[PDB]
Scaffold this motif. Structure first.
Motif, PDB file in Angstrom:
ATOM      1  N   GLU A 182      48.893  34.608  92.009  1.00  0.00           N
ATOM      2  CA  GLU A 182      49.409  35.356  90.877  1.00  0.00           C
ATOM      3  C   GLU A 182      50.821  35.776  91.196  1.00  0.00           C
ATOM      4  OE1 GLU A 182      49.673  38.743  89.203  1.00  0.00           O
ATOM      5  OE2 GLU A 182      50.109  39.627  91.163  1.00  0.00           O
ATOM      6  N   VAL A 214      44.805  45.550  95.695  1.00  0.00           N
ATOM      7  CA  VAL A 214      46.017  45.337  94.906  1.00  0.00           C
ATOM      8  C   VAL A 214      47.201  46.103  95.490  1.00  0.00           C
ATOM      9  CG1 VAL A 214      47.084  45.430  92.633  1.00  0.00           C
ATOM     10  CG2 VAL A 214      44.639  45.006  92.839  1.00  0.00           C
ATOM     11  N   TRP A 259      36.507  43.299  91.998  1.00  0.00           N
ATOM     12  CA  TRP A 259      37.042  42.534  90.871  1.00  0.00           C
ATOM     13  C   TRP A 259      36.048  41.514  90.405  1.00  0.00           C
ATOM     14  CZ3 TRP A 259      37.292  37.353  91.764  1.00  0.00           C
ATOM     15  CH2 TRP A 259      37.616  36.856  93.056  1.00  0.00           C
ATOM     16  N   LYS A 265      42.141  42.411  82.186  1.00  0.00           N
ATOM     17  CA  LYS A 265      43.184  41.500  81.788  1.00  0.00           C
ATOM     18  C   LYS A 265      42.535  40.259  81.252  1.00  0.00           C
ATOM     19  CE  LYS A 265      46.195  43.253  85.348  1.00  0.00           C
ATOM     20  NZ  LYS A 265      47.411  43.082  86.126  1.00  0.00           N
ATOM     21  N   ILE A 285      43.666  31.127  94.391  1.00  0.00           N
ATOM     22  CA  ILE A 285      44.212  31.870  93.277  1.00  0.00           C
ATOM     23  C   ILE A 285      45.601  32.363  93.624  1.00  0.00           C
ATOM     24  CG2 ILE A 285      43.975  33.861  91.698  1.00  0.00           C
ATOM     25  CD1 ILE A 285      40.954  33.785  92.242  1.00  0.00           C
ATOM     26  N   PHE A 296      46.066  49.057  83.582  1.00  0.00           N
ATOM     27  CA  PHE A 296      46.585  48.648  84.876  1.00  0.00           C
ATOM     28  C   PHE A 296      47.353  49.758  85.588  1.00  0.00           C
ATOM     29  CE2 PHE A 296      49.760  46.134  87.540  1.00  0.00           C
ATOM     30  CZ  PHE A 296      48.850  45.860  88.557  1.00  0.00           C
ATOM     31  N   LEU A 310      39.577  39.074  83.605  1.00  0.00           N
ATOM     32  CA  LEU A 310      39.595  39.692  84.926  1.00  0.00           C
ATOM     33  C   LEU A 310      39.297  41.171  84.751  1.00  0.00           C
ATOM     34  CD1 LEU A 310      40.570  40.039  88.016  1.00  0.00           C
ATOM     35  CD2 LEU A 310      42.799  40.515  86.966  1.00  0.00           C
ATOM     36  N   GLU A 370      40.885  39.950 102.282  1.00  0.00           N
ATOM     37  CA  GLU A 370      41.833  39.975 101.162  1.00  0.00           C
ATOM     38  C   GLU A 370      42.362  41.386 101.100  1.00  0.00           C
ATOM     39  OE1 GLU A 370      41.924  39.068  96.309  1.00  0.00           O
ATOM     40  OE2 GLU A 370      40.014  39.634  97.257  1.00  0.00           O
ATOM     41  N   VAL A 378      49.173  33.299  86.444  1.00  0.00           N
ATOM     42  CA  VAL A 378      48.029  33.112  87.350  1.00  0.00           C
ATOM     43  C   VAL A 378      47.688  31.619  87.421  1.00  0.00           C
ATOM     44  CG1 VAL A 378      45.553  33.478  87.584  1.00  0.00           C
ATOM     45  CG2 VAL A 378      47.085  35.414  87.040  1.00  0.00           C
ATOM     46  N   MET A 406      39.178  44.695  87.218  1.00  0.00           N
ATOM     47  CA  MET A 406      39.460  45.267  88.517  1.00  0.00           C
ATOM     48  C   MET A 406      39.008  46.710  88.430  1.00  0.00           C
ATOM     49  SD  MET A 406      43.235  43.819  89.299  1.00  0.00           S
ATOM     50  CE  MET A 406      43.613  44.157  87.603  1.00  0.00           C
ATOM     51  N   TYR A 461      43.358  36.237  79.916  1.00  0.00           N
ATOM     52  CA  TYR A 461      44.347  35.149  79.960  1.00  0.00           C
ATOM     53  C   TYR A 461      43.838  33.983  79.159  1.00  0.00           C
ATOM     54  CZ  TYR A 461      45.511  37.692  84.297  1.00  0.00           C
ATOM     55  OH  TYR A 461      45.815  38.673  85.245  1.00  0.00           O
TER      56      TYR A 461
HETATM   57  C1  LIG Z   1      47.464  42.419  87.197  1.00  0.00           C
HETATM   58  C2  LIG Z   1      46.448  41.735  87.708  1.00  0.00           C
HETATM   59  C3  LIG Z   1      46.336  41.455  89.014  1.00  0.00           C
HETATM   60  C4  LIG Z   1      47.367  41.939  89.972  1.00  0.00           C
HETATM   61  C5  LIG Z   1      45.286  40.727  89.429  1.00  0.00           C
HETATM   62  C6  LIG Z   1      45.305  39.940  90.500  1.00  0.00           C
HETATM   63  C7  LIG Z   1      44.234  39.205  90.853  1.00  0.00           C
HETATM   64  C8  LIG Z   1      43.961  38.113  90.142  1.00  0.00           C
HETATM   65  C9  LIG Z   1      44.826  37.745  88.984  1.00  0.00           C
HETATM   66  C10 LIG Z   1      42.799  37.209  90.444  1.00  0.00           C
HETATM   67  C11 LIG Z   1      41.706  37.967  91.152  1.00  0.00           C
HETATM   68  C12 LIG Z   1      42.279  38.639  92.371  1.00  0.00           C
HETATM   69  C13 LIG Z   1      43.388  39.620  92.037  1.00  0.00           C
HETATM   70  C14 LIG Z   1      44.296  39.700  93.253  1.00  0.00           C
HETATM   71  C15 LIG Z   1      42.783  40.978  91.755  1.00  0.00           C
END
Ligand SMILES: *C/C=C(C)/C=C/C1=C(C)CCCC1(C)C
Length: 137
Positions: A54, A76, A109, A132, A52, A15, A121, A73, A41, A123, A134
């Motif tokens: 987070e 990050v 993602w 990641k 979603i 990350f 997940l 959207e 999440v 990214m 979960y």
């Molecule tokens: C550390 C992980 C993230 C900041 C991820 C965020 C995220 C999700 C958990 C769901 C998919 C969209 C996204 C904003 C990438």
């Protein structure tokens, strides 16, 4: 496949490196990685519609979309994109993103629900990949 749930993180890989190529400065990065230690999440799925959320101790982000329909959207790191999610298979959706302004890393993602109830997940930013995993709380 129902992605709905309150999900807690059990593993994370790469990350901080993702943020670096996204150009997040070292100060903001350390703040982000530390907070990302204990996120929550929350997902709700109804058919192809999703919400979603987070949260970390420093910030909460929320998004909603429908599989197959363009939406907007942020990346990050906070840059605006047009996004579109498609099902890659019954248990895996993939989001492709196009930056609205300037140039930058190619971002995407994916979210996958395993048969033993893990949510995975991924990214991507250019060639850097963050993963990641979960489980439901
Ligand atoms: C550390 C992980 C993230 C900041 C991820 C965020 C995220 C999700 C958990 C769901 C998919 C969209 C996204 C904003 C990438």
């Amino acid at each position: 496949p129902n992605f709905s749930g309150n999900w807690k993180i059990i593993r994370s890989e790469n990350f901080e490196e993702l943020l670096k190529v996204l150009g997040v400065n070292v100060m903001l990065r350390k703040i982000a990685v530390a907070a990302a230690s204990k996120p929550a999440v929350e997902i709700k799925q109804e058919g192809d519609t999703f919400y979603i959320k987070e949260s970390t101790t420093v910030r909460t982000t929320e998004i909603n979309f429908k599989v197959g329909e363009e939406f907007e959207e942020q990346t990050v790191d906070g840059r605006p994109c047009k996004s579109l999610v498609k099902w890659e298979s019954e248990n895996k959706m993939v989001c492709e993103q196009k930056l609205l302004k300037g140039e930058g890393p190619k971002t995407s993602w994916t979210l996958e629900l395993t048969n033993d109830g893990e949510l995975i997940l991924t990214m991507t930013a250019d060639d850097v990949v963050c993963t990641k995993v979960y489980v439901r709380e």
